[PDB]
């Protein structure tokens, strides 16, 4: 194994939230890069509302991609422009096609991959940025590559990311690093659409329970005070 470090974040703090601006560029990445071979099936464009995009804007992406829906009255099926209810475009219809599109290897889903891998983000960010030349005395089949963070240090992961592989909207740098930041910020949101709200109840709880707990502890000590101050004696003849 290899243990990733504890890289800080804009959300590591126990009352820290996600930089939604970072998410906004993060979603660009999945569509331009990862959506060719990663099947995020547990998400739709509508969940991006109130998070990174708006109704009409995100809907513009549903108009962009075609989706297989609707039994025609002829008895056949067709393609339409998607909508906000529609989940993401699945790259490939089944897993086996993905194994066929690769060197026998499968891409996992990326919906809950963060919470389904030790370290979560810090694994992933260091995974992409852990590519290096193989060491001496190592050999690998074609298609496989080297990355220390992956178990076995042997993976059919083509390098997906590199500096100036694409460009973003507002125009921030398309480095291998900043891109790697927004994307891991993006995936944590995948398996946590509640982060913005978890901390909110994360905070409401304390200033109640921190406030009640003395009072109940007093009402306890209030009633018990009869016995916390009770004396006795023994007066037979």
């Amino acid at each position: 194994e290899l243990h990733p470090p504890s890289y800080p974040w804009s959300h590591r703090g126990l009352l820290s939230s996600l930089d939604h601006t970072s998410i906004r560029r993060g979603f660009q990445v999945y569509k331009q890069v990862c959506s060719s071979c990663h099947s995020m099936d547990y998400v739709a464009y509508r969940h991006l509302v109130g998070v990174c995009y708006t109704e009409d804007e995100a809907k513009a992406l549903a108009e962009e991609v075609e989706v297989q829906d609707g039994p025609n009255e002829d008895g056949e099926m067709f393609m339409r422009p998607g909508k906000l209810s529609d989940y993401f475009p699945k790259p490939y219809p089944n897993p086996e096609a993905a194994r066929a599109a690769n060197n026998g290897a499968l891409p996992p889903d990326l919906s809950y991959i963060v919470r389904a891998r030790h370290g979560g983000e810090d694994y992933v960010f260091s995974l992409l940025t852990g590519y290096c030349e193989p060491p001496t005395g190592v050999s690998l089949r074609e298609g496989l590559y080297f990355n220390p963070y992956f178990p076995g240090q042997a993976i059919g992961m083509a390098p997906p990311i590199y500096n100036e592989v694409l460009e973003f909207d507002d125009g921030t740098p398309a480095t291998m690093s900043q891109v790697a930041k927004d994307v891991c910020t993006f995936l944590r949101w995948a398996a946590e659409p509640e982060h913005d709200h978890r901390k909110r109840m994360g905070l409401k709880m304390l200033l109640m329970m921190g406030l009640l707990l003395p009072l109940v502890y007093a009402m306890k000590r209030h009633k018990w005070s009869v016995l916390k101050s009770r004396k006795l004696a023994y007066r037979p003849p």
Binding site: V216, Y217, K220, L227
Partner: protein, 370 residues
């Protein structure tokens, strides 16, 4: 006039030297009702089909209004549940509840009811540890000769785990808390003829007191700590105990490199994993649990408690090392630095219970001449 039976929770005699430990004795009533209450609303959107169950969990955590909390108030609630028990039960040893033979046995049947229940609760979401978590444990029942293959295939609904295995648990799992809900009353009934049992172990009949002002709020104070320690985890570290892998979809054609069920088996699972033999450890497993029914024939001291048996405390807190060790040693893999431990720790468990705690009272009686 069903108002006279509810005096046992209002106007009941009970002692006055009572610690904060016995908060835990009633939190289960709060864990159980809460857990049931949570899970019941939770199963409003569960589905008992392989093709949709894992997704049907995702139907909750994403699309339901504040339902995502309910996955964790329930799930990690089940961890806080067990945290009560092994603080509820080791109590009875450190204080001597176990002389109440009619009650102590009831305290076992709950545990096997639950630990076989919870085993059916981790498996529903098809986490890739659900499957193998159900495979390994259930596979062991093939250890028996001439029937092991039958009952296992019989419970698998075939020759291996499948959709048919799932639904058969979901009903067996949605139900037993209600069976516990009534057995809870039974567990309090045999109590009611004798009442509680102080830390000193002395029959405190002279100093039994009311219940509505004093221990009610005291339990509520504990329930607050429970809800606190529960609200903390769900809000701040819900991924702590619930292993990461269980968010993976199920696939029989691939395993993780490391297997372990949920943390709470691990004191027990390690005992089996210690034994290289298959069957030779299985009977030790349930024996490790069912020894509790066998302890009360080993109350050697004509005292009761252990606040007044200092040597017992030297052993008792040593037992906790073994459990908390087997907890950790269980959740770690099979290699030479760890096998050497469980081959001892397993023996230590049976050893501390059946040799040295009896040996104490046989001595402590002699140290004070009776």
């Amino acid at each position: 006039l069903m108002k006279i039976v509810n005096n046992a929770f209002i106007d009941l005699p009970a002692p006055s030297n009572i610690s904060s430990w016995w908060n835990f004795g009633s939190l289960l009533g709060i864990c159980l009702i809460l857990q049931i209450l949570t899970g019941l609303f939770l199963a409003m959107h569960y589905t008992s089909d392989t093709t949709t169950a894992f997704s049907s969990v995702t139907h909750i955590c994403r699309d339901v209004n504040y339902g995502w909390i309910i996955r964790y108030m329930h799930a990690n609630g089940a961890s806080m549940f067990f945290i009560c028990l092994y603080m509820h039960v080791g109590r009875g040893l450190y204080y001597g509840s176990y002389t109440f033979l009619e009650t102590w046995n009831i305290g076992v049947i709950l545990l096997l009811t639950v630990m076989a229940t919870a085993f059916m609760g981790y498996v529903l979401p098809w986490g890739q540890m659900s499957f193998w978590g159900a495979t390994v444990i259930t596979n062991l029942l093939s250890a028996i000769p001439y029937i092991g293959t039958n009952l296992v295939e019989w419970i698998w609904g075939g020759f291996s785990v499948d959709k048919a295995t799932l639904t058969r648990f979901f009903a067996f799992h949605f139900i037993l808390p209600f069976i516990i809900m009534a057995i809870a009353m039974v567990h309090l009934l045999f109590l009611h003829e004798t009442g509680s049992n102080n830390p000193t172990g002395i029959s405190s009949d002279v100093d039994k007191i009311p219940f509505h002002p004093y221990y009610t709020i005291k339990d509520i104070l504990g329930a607050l700590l429970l809800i606190l320690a529960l609200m903390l985890l769900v809000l701040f570290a819900p991924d702590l105990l619930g292993d990461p892998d269980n968010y993976t979809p199920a696939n029989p054609l691939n395993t993780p490199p490391h297997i372990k069920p949920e943390w709470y088996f691990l004191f027990a699972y390690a005992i089996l994993r210690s034994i290289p033999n298959k069957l030779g450890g299985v009977l030790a497993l349930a024996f490790s649990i069912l020894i509790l029914a066998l302890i009360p024939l080993l109350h050697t001291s004509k005292q009761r408690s252990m606040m007044f048996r200092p040597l017992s405390q030297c052993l008792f807190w040593a037992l906790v090392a073994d459990l908390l060790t087997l907890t950790w040693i269980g959740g770690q893999p099979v290699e030479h630095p760890y096998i050497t431990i469980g081959q001892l720790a397993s023996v230590l468990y049976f050893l501390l219970i059946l040799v040295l705690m009896p040996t104490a009272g046989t001595i402590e009686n002699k140290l004070l001449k009776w």
